[PDB]
């Protein structure tokens, strides 16, 4: 019994967790990350991003990404590979370049081909393009969008497909999990990629939610079905539910209800293949350093002890 065994019993492919290389030297941490009752899938939190894999142009660095793949491979866990094209965690040579459409397109395609070719056969899915939308659903004015225009999105997908025809190609974003301008625009990215004749298999819903402000199970399910109706699969890719500190029994209970609704929405949607939490212990959560006054976002606490959210997840997975 555990999150992943429970998820597979309801026809999900996995329940999984992100991690990061610095944490792999923590033996108690790695023992629980390697617990396949709870985790059947791993995402590298940083070591397959552009700054990590191509720190100088045409100079590729795969050791840290390969370390996470090797752990998943030893444990029998699926990989989600993350992420090819993103405005954040670009190396200096991308962000500082004097580019034409032609020279940035060649550099983007070369990044994708090299990284996807290296990981061919290793990934369940790639987050091909990450966070291409503004909160109003217009295109984020990244260097890719400014220099190439909207075509950079389907071109990224087509370039990934050519290098690895089998991996599921996902568009990944946050604040697309509930009805609004951004979710509508994420549907429209699915439609645009297919209009270009390029392949998109999945929508990745980050699910960085807030305790007591989490969308209802019903609102989440409506949005999941809105994507699956377009002939793609879906997954919750980076689930965490950040609480206004300090922690209280009431906030931990609300967090449990919030997590339970996310898992239950996925279980209720044919085509929702799985849930990945953005790491699993509060000790290593990205949240407190980014969201002032927020924290304690995960189903285990900073001592690797289960919080009520672990039970809420198990209930939402119908265990
Ligand atoms: C850098 O270099 C690259 C590589 O050379 C350049 O790539 C080109 O980029 C073009 C877009 O900038 C892209 O055009 C698109 O092609 C796809 C696929 O079209 C083919 O297949 C379809 C379907 O079978 C067929 O109908 C076509 O005839 C083609 O055979 C189209 O889906 C796209 O269509 C959308 O956009 C056009 C153009 O929209 C702009 O201009 C209009 C009118 O002036 C304006 O109203 C609009 O707001 C835009 O400013 C529309 O006319 C279409 O109706 C489509 O619009 C829908 O979809 C958009 C999203 O894609 C929505 O934003 C829009 O509201 C609406 O819902 C489009 O024609 C080329 O395929 C691509 N070429 C290659 C070789 O990859 C790149 O431009 C260049 N960048 C720069 C900055 O120079």
Enumerate the β-bridge partners of residue 127: 82, 170
Q: Give the closest residue (by CA) to ligand 1 atom 61.
A: 192
Nearest 5°: phi and psi at 43?
A: -120, 130
Distance CA 40, CA 3 (A): 9
H helical segments located in 96-210: 101-118, 143-148, 152-163, 181-195
Ligand 1 pocket: which residues have CB below 6 Å? 101, 105, 148-151, 155, 192, 195-196
Tokens of 192: 């645009």
Instruction: Answer whether 103's CB lies under 8 Å from 82's CB.
Output: no
Give, for ligand 1, the residue of 151, 153, 189, 190 to mutate: max count of ligand atoms closer than 8 Å to Cβ: 151
Q: How far is the CA of 73 from the centre of ligand 1 (A)?
A: 41
Classify each residue of 123-161 as buried b or exposed e, where b means 16 or more C-beta atoms within 10 Å of its C-beta: bbbbbbbbbbbeeebebeebbbbebbeebbbbbbbbbbb
CB neighbour list of residue 288: distance below 8 Å, 6 or more residues apart? 245, 294, 295
Q: Give the closest residue (by CA) to ligand 1 atom 10.
A: 151
Catalytic residue among 54, 177, 233, 238: 238
Enumerate the β-bridge partners of residue 240: 208
Q: How far is the CA of 196 from the centre of ligand 1 (A)?
A: 8
Q: How was this structure determined?
A: X-ray
Of the CA atoms within 13 Å of residue 170, those in its CB half-sphere come to 28
Place of tokens 């792999």: 24
Strand 233-244 relative to strand 294-295, pairing: antiparallel
Distance CA 274, CA 33 (A): 17
Annotated catalytic residue 302: no
Nearest 5°: phi and psi at 36?
A: -75, -10
Instruction: Answer whether 33's CB lies under 8 Å from 42's CB.
Output: yes
Angle between helices 249-267 and 217-228 (to 10 degrees): 30
Tokens of 63: 């050791």
Radius of gyration from C-alpha coordinates of the chain: 19
Distance CA 84, CA 94 (A): 13
Distance CA 45, CA 20 (A): 5
Tokens of 173: 């974003």
Which helix (DSSP H) or strand (DSSP E) does residue 176 occupy?
none
Catalytic residue among 23, 54, 131, 233: 131
Among 37, 45, 42, smallest CA distance to 20 is for 45
Among 155, 67, 45, smallest CA distance to 111 is for 155
Nearest 5°: phi and psi at 202?
A: -150, 155
Resolution in A: 1.6
Domains of the chain in start order, with CATH, are 3-317 (3.20.20.80)
Q: How far is the CA of 139 from the centre of ligand 1 (A)?
A: 14
Distance CA 14, CA 9 (A): 10
Which helix (DSSP H) or strand (DSSP E) does residue 260 occupy?
helix 249-267
Annotated catalytic residue 131: yes
């Amino acid at each position: 019994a555990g999150l992943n065994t429970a998820a597979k019993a309801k026809g999900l492919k996995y329940f999984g967790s992100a991690t990061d290389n610095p944490e792999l030297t923590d033996s108690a941490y790695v023992a629980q990350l390697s617990n396949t009752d709870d985790f059947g899938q791993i995402t590298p939190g940083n070591s397959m991003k552009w700054d990590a894999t191509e720190p100088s142009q045409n100079s590729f660095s795969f050791a840290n990404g390969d370390a996470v793949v090797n752990l998943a491979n030893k444990n029998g866990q699926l990989m989600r590979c993350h992420t090819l094209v993103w405005h954040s965690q670009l190396p200096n040579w991308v962000s500082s370049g004097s580019w034409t459409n032609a020279t940035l397109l060649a550099a983007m395609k070369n990044h994708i081909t090299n990284v996807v070719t290296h990981y061919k056969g290793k990934c369940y899915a790639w987050d091909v393009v990450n966070e291409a939308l503004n909160e109003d659903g217009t295109f984020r004015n990244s260097v890719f969008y400014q220099i190439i225009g909207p075509a950079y999105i389907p071109i990224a997908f087509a370039t990934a497909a050519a290098a690895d025809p089998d991996v599921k190609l996902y568009y990944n974003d946050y604040s697309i999990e509930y009805s609004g301008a951004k979710a509508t625009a994420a549907q429209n990215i699915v439609k645009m990629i297919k209009a270009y004749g390029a392949k998109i298999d999945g929508v990745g819903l980050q699910a960085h939610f807030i305790v007591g402000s989490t969308p209802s199970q019903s609102d989440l399910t409506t949005v999941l079905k809105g994507y699956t109706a377009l002939g793609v699969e879906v997954a919750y890719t980076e689930l965490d539910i950040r609480m206004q500190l300090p922690s209280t029994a009431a906030k931990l209970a609300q967090q449990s209800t919030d997590f339970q609704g996310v898992a239950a929405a996925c279980v209720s949607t044919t085509g929702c293949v799985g849930v990945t939490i953005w790491d699993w212990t509060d000790k290593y959560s990205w949240v407190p350093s980014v969201f002032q006054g927020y924290g304690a976002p995960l189903p285990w606490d900073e001592n690797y002890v289960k919080k009520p959210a672990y039970d809420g997840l198990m209930a939402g997975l119908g265990a």
